[PDB]
From a paper:
A coiled-coil domain (CCD) consists of two or more α-helices that are twisted around each other to form a superhelical structure. However, they are very versatile structural domains that can adopt many different structures. They can form different oligomeric complexes, and the helix orientation can either be parallel or antiparallel. To understand the detailed molecular functions of CC-containing proteins, it is absolutely necessary to determine the relative orientation of each coil, because the functional domain outside of a parallel CCD dimer must be in close proximity, whereas that outside an antiparallel CCD is located further away.
Author numbering:
A (entry chain B): 1 to 432
B (entry chain A): 4 to 431
Amino acid sequence: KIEEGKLVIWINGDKGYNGLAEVGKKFEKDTGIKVTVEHPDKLEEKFPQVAATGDGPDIIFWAHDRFGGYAQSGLLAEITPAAAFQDKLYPFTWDAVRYNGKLIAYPIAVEALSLIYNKDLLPNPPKTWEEIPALDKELKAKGKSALMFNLQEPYFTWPLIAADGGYAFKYENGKYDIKDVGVDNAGAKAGLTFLVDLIKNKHMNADTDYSIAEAAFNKGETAMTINGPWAWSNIDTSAVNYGVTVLPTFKGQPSKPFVGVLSAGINAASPNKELAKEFLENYLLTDEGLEAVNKDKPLGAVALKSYEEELAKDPRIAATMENAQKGEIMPNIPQMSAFWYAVRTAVINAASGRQTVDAALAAAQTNAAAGSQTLVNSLEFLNIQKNSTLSEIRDIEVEVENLRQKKEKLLGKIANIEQNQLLLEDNLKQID
Amino acid sequence: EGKLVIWINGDKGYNGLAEVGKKFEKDTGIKVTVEHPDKLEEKFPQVAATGDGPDIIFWAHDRFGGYAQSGLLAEITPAAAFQDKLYPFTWDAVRYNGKLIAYPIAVEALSLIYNKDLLPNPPKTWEEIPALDKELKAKGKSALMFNLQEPYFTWPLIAADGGYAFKYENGKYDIKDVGVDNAGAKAGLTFLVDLIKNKHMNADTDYSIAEAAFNKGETAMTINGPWAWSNIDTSAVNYGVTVLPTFKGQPSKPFVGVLSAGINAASPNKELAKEFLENYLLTDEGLEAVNKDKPLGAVALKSYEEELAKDPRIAATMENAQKGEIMPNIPQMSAFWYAVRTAVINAASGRQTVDAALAAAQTNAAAGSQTLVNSLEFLNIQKNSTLSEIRDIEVEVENLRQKKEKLLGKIANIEQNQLLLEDNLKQI
Ligand SMILES: OC[C@H]1O[C@H](O[C@H]2[C@H](O)[C@@H](O)[C@@H](O)O[C@@H]2CO)[C@H](O)[C@@H](O)[C@@H]1O
Ligand SMILES: OC[C@H]1O[C@H](O[C@H]2[C@H](O)[C@@H](O)[C@@H](O)O[C@@H]2CO)[C@H](O)[C@@H](O)[C@@H]1O
């Protein structure tokens, strides 16, 4: 299971996992505990599968949006940093990781999507989505293309969907109404329609994913991309002159990225709970840990006031936080994965051309309205956790029965010894 | 839309299938479009729930009971004359709750495929394959590689010693008696994971990696269906198709699939699709056209199977099929397959023990009544989608009714005028 005496850490393959593993060498070269940093596929879906059986990593890194489901499923340990540690991180980053009054993870860095443009194929990035087609017609005349970004994950297409009024769960009076879902409304329809019209007019391709878009931009084949800070590393080494700027407006309104706070939770099945705490607070969440990670793949606007006051002078970080301000902080409520799955389907099926935008989003709206899928999903993981726990109990009872069998055989040995002692003590009394 | 669009999976002979689409277009002039989208079996119900998707969908029969329960498949209406051209047991695979829900095309089963120059005889047992891999490793080769990402391919071994999906007895399936947890399933999956731990296979091998290695002569054995024989033909590896090895002395038990063609319930071209399938595909000419692209296996059309049955590769196919089981077509199959995919991937990667992986899958698959909620979801989507078409029509009707009312105004006023002129005329 989760071997005790070591820390295993999961973080997504696009993050600075090699830089994080350097913070693991320091932990291992300093405290002797070994640290293994892995980047599995579909990490956010494997974690609850294995953690439900007491397996998985000690620490799981993901944006805070997924952690409310992990918590409701009972898979997360209680985070308990001291008030002294709390004043080192911006309070709004602690806000992202608070669910029903408990801190369910440590905030690390603030992520938001920005516009990234090739400084030499385009001297000024377009201020509006609406001008991007004309730019692409011109740019293709030179053998290049205007824009390429990942169309497979709704994270990347939502800023445009949300611009004119799309929303996940209505947020009002400080609370989300999970039956007021806004993926159906006219704003959402107009955004996805513009996107599918871009595809159908041959300005982008529905088959484009993350790898194809990064390859295309870093080779000077596309004028613009949409991505987070992690992507800056690979663009640096391509010797492309790139700028990071505000996302284009749509119908006169800013694109609204959903803002992620990359967070570290501690597996509820971890025996190394306090070892994990010390790693995060006194190794990761410091200038040298964060800088080691950050120089692998930039983290974005880190939550630690100490190192952030230094990264904030990067113009790319300001442009990140300006885009972040125009968007909305993602909810962390359990229904987010259900929301994300509904919107993922819609975008792929509308982009593929085999469903209309109107039909795709009407389906997604009703699906997302079924947010009581997360109750069934949490109950499922809890029923796996229970059966696994009963199984450990039965193993213990076999151990106890074996021991009990040895004991009974020893008591038998003693019974026979006592027979002898009675015999010899009578033999001795008669010599007397 | 006056044309036929068809979905079929990318490992099938879609190029050959399109040739039958031309021969359809040259006779009726109707265009035939053959696409092989990824995850078609999962996209289909998403889009058909809103009245979209393809006209015809090709997949193994196991998925069609869920499509039918969600109300997304048209009732097939073969004439008694046409029904007697197909083996009756292939009709049973596509029969769900008394209705025929698709046309059967071909019977599929996995076989062992081995390099006859790397191996004089296929192994009789799974248990000897490690020793064989060692001997081969010393020569720069490997014993066995097959797709480990899809539970379809690992099931023959999982079932060998007693694993099963849903218990079948008295003619019906008990969807609460699930056999992915039992000692037979565990022993099969444990053997698979030990192969990986001992470096005889790699948990990341998938379909593409395994085919390449075998067709390049890099590995002595693979496990695959008939669709794969074409590419091995063009590679000039000397290969045999044979019965799978035994495990713990018992036959491997592959799940048998009947490639089937369903007709979308929202298709306006239902009769064209019927005509395409009955009188173009399901004939000695059409099945041969597909079969020459990528072999189909044992086709359902008695006339063309009589010829195929002479191919020893088809005999070995049918011998493997007989040791296995025809897959259920019940709605719970998708939940079953997803649960077992999870277990195999998580245990093969080493993140979970076999016991824990399969205990979780057992409890998941035991909740197969997520297919009832899932169908109820698709139906309420279909209903809401339909109500919107209705509301669009009713706007057209009210507009037309307003245009009418305005014309009745013109007529009323003309009659006023006529009254004036006709009395003024009676005075004159
Ligand atoms: O639904 C898409 C996806 O959006 C976010 O995932 C992001 C992640 O937050 C980023 O750090 C980066 O890794 O890209 C991911 C998308 O590819 C949500 O955090 C995630 O839950 C959601 O599924
Ligand atoms: O995966 C290759 C193989 O997959 C199919 O078998 C499926 C089954 O039919 C599906 O419902 C799926 O979810 O489970 C098995 C894969 O794990 C096809 O039957 C076969 O033709 C195709 O090549």
